[PDB]
Short mmCIF file of all heavy atoms in Angstrom, two decimals:
data_model
loop_
_atom_site.label_atom_id
_atom_site.label_comp_id
_atom_site.label_asym_id
_atom_site.label_seq_id
_atom_site.Cartn_x
_atom_site.Cartn_y
_atom_site.Cartn_z
N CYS A 142 98.03 100.19 111.91
CA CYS A 142 96.84 99.82 111.13
C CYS A 142 96.49 100.70 110.03
O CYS A 142 96.04 100.19 108.93
CB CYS A 142 95.75 99.23 111.97
SG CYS A 142 95.98 97.71 112.79
N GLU A 143 96.58 102.03 110.23
CA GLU A 143 96.30 102.95 109.25
C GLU A 143 97.23 102.83 108.16
O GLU A 143 96.79 102.79 106.90
CB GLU A 143 96.55 104.37 109.98
CG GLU A 143 96.37 105.60 108.93
CD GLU A 143 97.03 106.86 109.57
OE1 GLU A 143 97.75 106.93 110.58
OE2 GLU A 143 96.69 108.07 108.96
N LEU A 144 98.52 102.62 108.39
CA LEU A 144 99.46 102.43 107.28
C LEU A 144 99.14 101.08 106.50
O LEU A 144 99.14 101.10 105.23
CB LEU A 144 100.86 102.41 107.82
CG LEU A 144 101.96 102.14 106.80
CD1 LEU A 144 102.00 103.22 105.63
CD2 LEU A 144 103.36 102.05 107.52
N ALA A 145 98.82 100.04 107.23
CA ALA A 145 98.61 98.75 106.58
C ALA A 145 97.46 98.87 105.54
O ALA A 145 97.57 98.43 104.38
CB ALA A 145 98.19 97.67 107.66
N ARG A 146 96.38 99.62 105.93
CA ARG A 146 95.26 99.77 104.99
C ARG A 146 95.65 100.70 103.85
O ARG A 146 95.26 100.49 102.69
CB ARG A 146 94.12 100.33 105.81
CG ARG A 146 93.48 99.19 106.64
CD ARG A 146 92.16 99.71 107.17
NE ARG A 146 92.28 100.90 108.15
CZ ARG A 146 92.46 100.76 109.48
NH1 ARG A 146 92.64 99.61 109.96
NH2 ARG A 146 92.63 101.87 110.19
N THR A 147 96.42 101.80 104.17
CA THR A 147 96.91 102.73 103.20
C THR A 147 97.68 101.95 102.14
O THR A 147 97.47 102.19 100.94
CB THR A 147 97.70 103.70 103.77
OG1 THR A 147 96.97 104.54 104.81
CG2 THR A 147 98.29 104.83 102.80
N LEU A 148 98.63 101.19 102.53
CA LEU A 148 99.41 100.36 101.61
C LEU A 148 98.62 99.38 100.75
O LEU A 148 98.85 99.14 99.64
CB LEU A 148 100.51 99.56 102.35
CG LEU A 148 101.66 100.36 103.06
CD1 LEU A 148 102.48 99.51 103.87
CD2 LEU A 148 102.52 101.08 102.12
N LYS A 149 97.67 98.74 101.37
CA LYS A 149 96.79 97.74 100.75
C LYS A 149 95.95 98.46 99.62
O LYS A 149 95.93 98.10 98.51
CB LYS A 149 95.73 97.13 101.71
CG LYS A 149 95.17 95.98 101.08
CD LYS A 149 94.25 95.15 102.04
CE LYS A 149 93.74 93.87 101.55
NZ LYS A 149 93.19 93.97 100.23
N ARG A 150 95.49 99.72 99.94
CA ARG A 150 94.83 100.53 98.98
C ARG A 150 95.61 100.94 97.75
O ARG A 150 95.15 100.93 96.62
CB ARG A 150 94.31 101.77 99.67
CG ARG A 150 92.77 102.02 99.47
CD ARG A 150 92.18 102.43 100.81
NE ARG A 150 92.93 103.40 101.60
CZ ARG A 150 92.70 103.58 102.98
NH1 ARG A 150 91.72 102.91 103.60
NH2 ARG A 150 93.45 104.44 103.61
N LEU A 151 96.93 101.06 97.97
CA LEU A 151 97.97 101.43 96.97
C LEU A 151 98.51 100.13 96.20
O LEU A 151 99.35 100.34 95.43
CB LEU A 151 99.11 102.20 97.59
CG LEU A 151 98.67 103.65 98.13
CD1 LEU A 151 99.78 104.20 98.87
CD2 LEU A 151 98.32 104.54 96.86
N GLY A 152 97.97 99.07 96.52
CA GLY A 152 98.39 97.79 95.65
C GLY A 152 99.65 97.16 96.12
O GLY A 152 100.28 96.31 95.31
N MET A 153 100.08 97.19 97.24
CA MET A 153 101.20 96.68 97.90
C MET A 153 101.20 95.16 98.32
O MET A 153 102.02 94.48 98.29
CB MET A 153 101.82 97.52 98.99
CG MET A 153 102.33 98.83 98.53
SD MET A 153 103.89 98.55 97.52
CE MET A 153 104.97 99.07 98.72
N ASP A 154 99.93 94.76 98.71
CA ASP A 154 99.71 93.39 99.20
C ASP A 154 100.09 92.32 98.11
O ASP A 154 99.35 92.12 97.20
CB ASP A 154 98.32 93.24 99.74
CG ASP A 154 98.13 91.92 100.54
OD1 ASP A 154 99.17 91.33 100.85
OD2 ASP A 154 96.94 91.72 100.98
N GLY A 155 101.18 91.69 98.32
CA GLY A 155 101.68 90.66 97.38
C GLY A 155 102.34 91.23 96.20
O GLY A 155 102.53 90.42 95.15
N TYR A 156 102.69 92.48 96.19
CA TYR A 156 103.28 93.00 94.99
C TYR A 156 104.63 92.26 94.75
O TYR A 156 105.47 92.37 95.63
CB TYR A 156 103.56 94.62 95.15
CG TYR A 156 104.10 95.25 93.92
CD1 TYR A 156 103.26 95.58 92.74
CD2 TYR A 156 105.42 95.44 93.67
CE1 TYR A 156 103.81 96.02 91.64
CE2 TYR A 156 105.99 95.89 92.53
CZ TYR A 156 105.18 96.26 91.45
OH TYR A 156 105.67 96.65 90.32
N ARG A 157 104.82 91.76 93.52
CA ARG A 157 105.98 91.03 93.22
C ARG A 157 106.28 89.96 94.24
O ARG A 157 107.41 89.73 94.63
CB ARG A 157 107.21 91.90 93.03
CG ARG A 157 107.11 92.90 91.81
CD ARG A 157 107.35 92.08 90.50
NE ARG A 157 108.75 91.82 90.41
CZ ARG A 157 109.15 90.90 89.38
NH1 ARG A 157 108.25 90.41 88.55
NH2 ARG A 157 110.46 90.61 89.40
N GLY A 158 105.18 89.30 94.75
CA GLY A 158 105.29 88.24 95.79
C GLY A 158 105.63 88.70 97.23
O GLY A 158 105.66 87.90 98.02
N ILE A 159 105.61 90.01 97.50
CA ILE A 159 105.80 90.56 98.78
C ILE A 159 104.61 90.80 99.64
O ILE A 159 103.79 91.76 99.22
CB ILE A 159 106.72 91.71 98.73
CG1 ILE A 159 107.89 91.57 98.02
CG2 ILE A 159 107.01 92.30 100.19
CD1 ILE A 159 108.52 92.82 97.30
N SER A 160 104.36 90.17 100.69
CA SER A 160 103.10 90.36 101.40
C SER A 160 103.09 91.76 102.16
O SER A 160 104.03 92.36 102.43
CB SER A 160 103.08 89.30 102.59
OG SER A 160 104.15 89.53 103.55
N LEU A 161 101.90 92.16 102.58
CA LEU A 161 101.74 93.33 103.16
C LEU A 161 102.64 93.48 104.49
O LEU A 161 103.14 94.55 104.80
CB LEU A 161 100.25 93.61 103.54
CG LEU A 161 99.77 95.07 103.66
CD1 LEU A 161 100.01 95.73 102.33
CD2 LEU A 161 98.28 95.12 104.03
N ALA A 162 102.55 92.48 105.35
CA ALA A 162 103.35 92.23 106.53
C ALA A 162 104.85 92.56 106.37
O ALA A 162 105.54 93.08 107.27
CB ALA A 162 103.07 90.95 107.23
N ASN A 163 105.40 92.21 105.21
CA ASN A 163 106.83 92.38 104.93
C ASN A 163 107.01 93.88 104.77
O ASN A 163 108.03 94.49 105.23
CB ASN A 163 107.23 91.62 103.77
CG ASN A 163 107.72 90.25 104.15
OD1 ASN A 163 108.84 90.05 104.83
ND2 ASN A 163 106.93 89.17 103.83
N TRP A 164 106.11 94.52 104.02
CA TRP A 164 106.13 96.00 103.77
C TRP A 164 106.04 96.79 105.05
O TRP A 164 106.71 97.74 105.24
CB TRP A 164 105.11 96.43 102.73
CG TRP A 164 105.31 96.05 101.33
CD1 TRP A 164 104.50 95.12 100.58
CD2 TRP A 164 106.33 96.36 100.47
NE1 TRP A 164 104.91 95.05 99.34
CE2 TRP A 164 106.11 95.79 99.17
CE3 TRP A 164 107.49 97.17 100.52
CZ2 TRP A 164 106.94 95.99 98.05
CZ3 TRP A 164 108.23 97.39 99.37
CH2 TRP A 164 107.98 96.78 98.14
N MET A 165 105.18 96.31 105.94
CA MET A 165 104.92 96.90 107.30
C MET A 165 106.25 96.77 108.08
O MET A 165 106.70 97.70 108.75
CB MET A 165 103.83 96.23 108.04
CG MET A 165 102.38 96.57 107.46
SD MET A 165 101.95 98.32 107.57
CE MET A 165 102.10 98.69 109.32
N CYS A 166 106.81 95.53 108.06
CA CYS A 166 108.06 95.37 108.80
C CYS A 166 109.14 96.24 108.27
O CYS A 166 109.96 96.80 109.11
CB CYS A 166 108.36 93.88 108.74
SG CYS A 166 109.90 93.42 109.67
N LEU A 167 109.26 96.35 107.03
CA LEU A 167 110.22 97.28 106.48
C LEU A 167 110.10 98.70 106.79
O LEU A 167 111.07 99.42 107.24
CB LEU A 167 110.16 97.15 104.80
CG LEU A 167 111.11 98.20 104.00
CD1 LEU A 167 112.51 97.67 104.25
CD2 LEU A 167 110.72 98.23 102.59
N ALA A 168 108.89 99.26 106.70
CA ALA A 168 108.56 100.69 107.11
C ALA A 168 108.79 100.91 108.67
O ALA A 168 109.39 101.93 108.91
CB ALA A 168 107.12 101.10 106.77
N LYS A 169 108.43 99.95 109.39
CA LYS A 169 108.61 99.91 110.74
C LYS A 169 110.10 100.14 111.11
O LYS A 169 110.41 101.11 111.93
CB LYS A 169 108.04 98.76 111.40
CG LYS A 169 108.54 98.42 112.84
CD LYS A 169 108.08 99.46 113.86
CE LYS A 169 108.50 98.96 115.24
NZ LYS A 169 109.87 98.43 115.28
N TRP A 170 110.96 99.28 110.72
CA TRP A 170 112.37 99.32 110.98
C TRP A 170 113.13 100.51 110.15
O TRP A 170 114.04 100.96 110.64
CB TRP A 170 112.97 97.97 110.73
CG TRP A 170 112.56 97.02 111.76
CD1 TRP A 170 111.62 96.01 111.43
CD2 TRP A 170 112.87 97.06 113.15
NE1 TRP A 170 111.46 95.39 112.76
CE2 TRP A 170 112.14 96.10 113.75
CE3 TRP A 170 113.62 97.90 113.80
CZ2 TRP A 170 112.21 95.82 115.10
CZ3 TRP A 170 113.79 97.63 115.28
CH2 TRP A 170 113.00 96.65 115.83
N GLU A 171 112.65 100.75 108.99
CA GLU A 171 113.42 101.84 108.25
C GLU A 171 113.16 103.29 108.84
O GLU A 171 114.11 104.03 109.01
CB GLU A 171 112.99 101.85 106.77
CG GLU A 171 113.48 100.76 105.95
CD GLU A 171 114.97 100.70 105.83
OE1 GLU A 171 115.65 101.67 106.07
OE2 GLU A 171 115.55 99.59 105.34
N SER A 172 111.88 103.54 109.26
CA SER A 172 111.63 104.92 109.75
C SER A 172 110.66 105.00 110.91
O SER A 172 110.39 106.21 111.26
CB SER A 172 110.94 105.63 108.52
OG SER A 172 109.73 105.00 108.24
N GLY A 173 110.12 103.96 111.30
CA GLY A 173 109.15 104.02 112.40
C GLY A 173 107.77 104.61 111.80
O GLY A 173 107.16 105.35 112.57
N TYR A 174 107.59 104.29 110.59
CA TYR A 174 106.39 104.79 109.88
C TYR A 174 106.27 106.18 109.68
O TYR A 174 105.25 106.87 109.73
CB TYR A 174 105.11 104.36 110.58
CG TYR A 174 105.02 102.83 110.98
CD1 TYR A 174 104.55 102.42 112.21
CD2 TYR A 174 105.34 101.85 110.04
CE1 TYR A 174 104.46 101.15 112.60
CE2 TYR A 174 105.26 100.47 110.43
CZ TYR A 174 104.74 100.10 111.68
OH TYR A 174 104.67 98.77 112.07
N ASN A 175 107.49 106.91 109.49
CA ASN A 175 107.61 108.34 109.46
C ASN A 175 107.98 108.78 108.01
O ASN A 175 109.07 108.50 107.53
CB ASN A 175 108.70 108.77 110.41
CG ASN A 175 108.96 110.32 110.38
OD1 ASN A 175 108.20 110.99 109.81
ND2 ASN A 175 110.11 110.76 111.14
#
C-alpha cells in the first residue's frame, strides 16, 4: 500500500491508460517492490 500511494502521488494512476493496479502488478513481479 505504501508503494500504491507513492505511485499515485507521482502521477501513475491511469498514465497513458494504465491503471495503478497494473503498475503494482508490474513492480510486484519484476522486483518484489525492491
Side-chain angles (χ1 to χ4, degrees):
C142 289
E143 175 193 11
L144 178 60
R146 292 188 293 271
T147 298
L148 294 173
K149 194 175 192 306
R150 231 131 45 198
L151 292 168
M153 290 293 256
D154 194 8
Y156 185 79
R157 294 282 291 168
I159 307 153
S160 70
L161 206 64
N163 272 288
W164 290 117
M165 287 299 297
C166 183
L167 176 70
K169 162 62 174 45
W170 291 107
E171 289 295 345
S172 64
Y174 309 138
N175 180 11

